[PDB]
């Protein structure tokens, strides 16, 4: 690892048990290595899960703290590496973190987002995806609103189409009736969206409330023959048992 790195640690840790053991200067110093040298680092799309594995085994030999505060930290944007990794669909490293066992996964960055919501835009590519993600999703808070809309990692991904996050979430018992900041359902999105393989795996959850309406009075139903998606319409209707 970068000296400069392990020095940039040893200083967090000082500073992690005493706030006066280093001046404000020094502080950011610490604070900026460690975002270069081991954020920009693990954050890349194709970082190596291996690399990243070294990094935490050397981290843990020092204060429970600091493997902590360096997992978590934190860029300009509230970013962490979780975010990025989960971002980039890196689910290797993703898989990394998660094994440290320190890892925050319902810590939103400064647009209002954990990387249990920023799941919601990726494309899962093999069963090692689906297994990293379950895992993700079996640790966090599944039903938590993002401060942007109040919008549920379900919601989101039925808006990006992402039928694996989907079904992800519905195998951790995602709850399908929360409504956003505009009344919106994950199944009125799917109506609008014309996502029919999704509205039919959100229909298939028994607690599925299909009597919900948005701020505008409208119901799945009325989205989706506003959409012009007939084939939704019948899977409400098979649902409702006409």
Partial sequence: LSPDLISACLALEKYLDNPNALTERELKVAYTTVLQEWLRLA????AH???????????RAMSARLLDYVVNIADSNGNTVLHY?????????????LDSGVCKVDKQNRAGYSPIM??????????????TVLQLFRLGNINAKASQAGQTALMLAVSHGRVDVVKALLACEADVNVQDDDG????MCACEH??????????AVPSC???????????????????????????????MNI
């Fill in 43 to 46: 954050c890349r799309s194709d």
């Fill in 49 to 59: 899960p291996e690399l990243v594995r070294r990094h935490l085994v050397t981290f």
């Fill in 85 to 97: 990794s989960v971002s980039h669909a890196n689910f290797p490293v993703v898989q990394q973190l």
């Fill in 118 to 131: 920023l799941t919601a835009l990726a494309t899962l590519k093999t069963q090692d995806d689906i297994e």
């Fill in 184 to 187: 919106s359902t994950a199944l």
């Fill in 194 to 203: 014309g996502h029919k393989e999704i509205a039919g795996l959100l229909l």
């Fill in 209 to 239: 409330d299909i009597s919900l309406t948005d701020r505008d009075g409208s119901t799945a139903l009325m989205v989706a023959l506003d959409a012009g998606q007939s084939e939704i319409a019948s899977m409400l209707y098979s649902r």
